[PDB]
Design a protein around this ligand. Structure first.
Ligand SMILES: [Ca+2]
Ligand SMILES: [Ca+2]
Ligand SMILES: [Zn+2]
Lengths: 399, 122
């Protein structure tokens, strides 16, 4: 192919220094991403022995990621060949992609994750590029987490070693620094105009996903809106419900709590934090296989607990985990015995258990409020969150 | 952080934790954190005839010697649900405190629940 020839050339010579590789790598990457016959290009490079060479000399992990994500994502019938060549190449320099944000993914796992993700995006309808939407500039206080900011939790500076110890010791001022920003939920909503609310919703939903696998997409990453809508379709929900759940979480979220959420999850302690857009709990994602529809079983069986925590910090994975969990809460509700849930009955008089089994388009508003309570807290134990129902309801209204 | 004194027909004496709502129950009082919080604390303090289970964990509480247990359930986005059960000798009887809250940051201190139990008598 045109692209194989081109790449054959950049490979026609060894590389002097770190910078040459840098520019040559960048150039092969773009060629791959703009190539219209990606399968035939891989087949040509395979034949030449050049496919293996390509992987061997795109050295710096940062660039190996872009290369591996792009190839895994763009190829189909020849993808197995790229995987084969990658594996062969790893024998020498095994470092591959397994560094920084991606330390919990073996390199081949990174390839397989990109492959599944690319396939799921096309299949489920969220491959299409998002518009460069605007993100909040906040770094503190309510709505300063990834939802508002677009800053991936995984990119945040380590919490100082000293403060980590203070967290472990439950030092009030430090715990406060790193926890839910909100106490009085109603008081927070009160300081927001309907326009402010609407602006938070747009900010939240309109910006590109903060993904850990950007090059697994054909072009730029999709908007969160696109991912939520795809997830609504897959789980028989609505993007508006998914949106309202996440917006509420994200108002009760700060940059600092993001940092805590992720770092504690991947620490010695392997804390069971709630992470990312929908604040999904690590143990919950594992126990209910919340990644089932984005990742194939082989990959899923290989993920360590910390790889799971890291995925929860990738917006698409989080959004699908959140949606799947919502559908799970609703299904479980539809199977309850309402006479055995009198507190629920009391707080939400128009609740309709049967309706939960179907699309939210038909839920009474009280189903939304009840589910909200049963999303922050244990589901359908008849013990309620006093404040989350109205908090989520308000966000729902905005959508 | 305690205010009103509360006395049960069964002889149990405790204080109402400040910022909490008190309700009388079968053998004591229930306290639910005030306001409309995302994740309120819930406490119960009861008089109990039956002795605790053998071999529970043991902790020094004031003068000393409570036996307790902490259980962790799946919760929601505010974290797992944590339940304390704690018993102190009250002569030949027992005073018992149950407490609940969610935490995504590991086991809660339950400081307020321990306090309540410590300041409890009959
Ligand atoms: Ca939060
Ligand atoms: Ca509940
Ligand atoms: Zn959290």
């Amino acid at each position: 192919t045109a692209t194989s020839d081109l790449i054959e050339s950049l490979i026609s010579y060894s590389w002097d220094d770190w910078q040459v590789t840098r520019q040559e790598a960048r150039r092969v990457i773009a060629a791959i991403r703009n190539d219209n016959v990606p399968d035939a290009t891989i087949a040509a490079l395979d034949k030449s022995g050049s496919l293996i060479k390509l992987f061997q000399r795109v050295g710096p992990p940062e660039l190996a990621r872009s290369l591996i994500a792009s190839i895994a994502g763009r190829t189909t019938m020849q993808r197995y060949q790229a995987r084969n060549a990658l594996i062969r190449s790893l024998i020498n320099n095994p470092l591959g992609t397994q560094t920084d944000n991606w330390i919990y993914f073996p390199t081949i796992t990174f390839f397989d994750i990109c492959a599944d993700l690319a396939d799921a995006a096309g299949r489920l309808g969220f491959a299409a590029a998002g518009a460069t939407g605007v993100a909040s500039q906040a770094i503190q206080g309510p709505f300063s987490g990834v939802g508002a900011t677009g800053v991936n939790p995984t990119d945040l500076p380590s919490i100082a070693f000293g403060d980590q110890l203070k967290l472990l010791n439950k030092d009030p001022a430090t715990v406060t620094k790193y926890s839910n920003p909100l106490g009085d939920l109603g008081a927070y909503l009160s300081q927001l105009s309907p326009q402010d609310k609407l602006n938070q919703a747009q900010t939240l939903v309109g910006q590109p996903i903060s993904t850990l696998f950007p090059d697994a997409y054909p072009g730029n990453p999709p908007s969160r809106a696109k991912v939520m809508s795809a997830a609504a379709r897959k789980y028989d929900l609505t993007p508006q419900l998914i949106g309202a759940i996440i917006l509420a979480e994200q108002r009760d979220q700060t940059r600092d709590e993001d940092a805590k959420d992720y770092q504690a999850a991947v620490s010695i302690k392997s804390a069971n934090t709630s992470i990312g857009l929908g604040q999904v709990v690590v143990s919950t994602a594992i126990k209910y296989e919340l990644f089932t529809d984005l990742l194939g079983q082989p990959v899923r069986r290989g993920l360590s607990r910390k790889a799971v925590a890291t995925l929860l910090a990738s917006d698409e994975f989080n959004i699908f985990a959140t949606a799947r969990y919502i559908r799970y809460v609703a299904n479980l509700a539809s199977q309850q015995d309402l006479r055995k849930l009198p507190k629920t009955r009391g707080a939400f008089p128009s609740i309709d258990l049967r309706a939960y089994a179907g699309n939210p388009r038909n839920w009474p508003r009280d189903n939304v409020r009840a589910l909200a309570s049963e999303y922050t807290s244990r589901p359908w134990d008849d013990n309620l969150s006093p404040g989350w129902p109205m908090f989520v309801d308000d966000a729902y209204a905005t959508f | 952080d305690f205010d009103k004194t509360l006395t049960h027909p069964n002889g149990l004496v405790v204080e109402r934790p400040v910022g909490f709502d008190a309700r009388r129950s079968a053998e004591g009082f229930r306290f639910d954190e005030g306001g409309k919080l995302r994740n309120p604390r819930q406490l119960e303090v009861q008089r109990q005839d039956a002795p605790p289970p053998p071999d529970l964990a043991s902790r020094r509480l004031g003068d000393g010697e409570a036996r307790y247990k902490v259980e962790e359930d799946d919760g929601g986005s505010a974290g797992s649900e944590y339940r304390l059960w704690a018993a102190k000798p009250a002569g030949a009887r027992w005073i018992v405190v149950s407490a609940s809250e969610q935490s995504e940051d590991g086991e809660p201190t339950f400081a307020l629940a321990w306090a309540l139990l410590e300041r409890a008598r009959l």
